Amino acid sequence: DILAKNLFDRSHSNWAPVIDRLYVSEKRFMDIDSREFSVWLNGTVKYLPFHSILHLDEMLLEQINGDVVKFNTHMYECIFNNLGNLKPTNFNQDGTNDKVILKMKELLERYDKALKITEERINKVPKMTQAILN
RNA sequence: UUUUAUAUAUAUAUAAUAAGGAAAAGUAUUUAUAAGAA
Numbered sequence: 530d531i532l533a534k535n536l537f538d539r540s541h542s543n544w545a546p547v548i549d550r551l552y553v554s555e556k557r558f559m560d561i562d563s564r565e566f567s568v569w570l571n572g573t574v575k576y577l578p579f580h581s582i583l584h585l586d587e588m589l590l591e592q593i594n595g596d597v598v599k600f601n602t603h604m605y606e607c608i609f610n611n612l613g614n615l616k617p618t619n620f621n622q623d624g625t626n627d628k629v630i631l632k633m634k635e636l637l638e639r640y641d642k643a644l645k646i647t648e649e650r651i652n653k654v655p656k657m658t659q660a661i662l663n
Numbered sequence: 664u665u666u667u668a669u670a671u672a673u674a675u676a677u678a679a680u681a682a683g684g685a686a687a688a689g690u691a692u693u694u695a696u697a698a699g700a701a
Contacts, residue, residue, distance in 0.1 A: 564668065571666095572680060602666060603680090610682060658665060660682040 544574050548581040551588065558592040567603035577611045579628065585611070586636075597643040602655045608636060609661040 531550055535543040551557060558566070570585075577585065586608055593599045612629050621627070643655060 568667070568680065606666075606680095606682080613682070653667085656666070658682090660665070663682045 542573075545578055545581045547574075548577065548584050548588075552584045557588050561592065563593065563599070563601060564603075567601050567607070571603050571607040571610070574607065575610055576614045579615060582608060582611045582615075583632075586632075597639050598647045598650070598655075600639065600643060600655065602658065605636065605640065605655065606658060606660055609633065613663070 531546045535541075535546060574585075589600070589604055589608075612633055615629055617627060617629070640655060640657060647654065
């Protein structure tokens, strides 16, 4: 029913019902191939709302068992694209407490921890891309 | 482009994928001075 309500209209594809369904669903994204999934998510899922993006980030983390190292570059591109497409809720006069920038940074230290943990494991690698910076 | 996939011996060949869209009105003194003709 979710697909019929929103996705049939090509101009605006609302994936918030989809992310809500899979979050409520117990299976979540587990036992799904990382790679075909990551490319599909990046390709099709965009212009999500914030609460949907938080659920997406958490569900990808749980799918990949919390291994920050495994969290692929496409996963970053998808989350960062969704966060960038968001407009500010309001232009705060100071303009430093925005939720989006905080989550964006949080993913950045997650990438740094991924590199550090892989190197300490020594004792593919994810890449930061120009799309994320943009 | 970028990233990734399959295959092959860190690298190579093919396939897919592209983040750059912002709207608004009003806010003079100029300078020195070179002419040719039969």
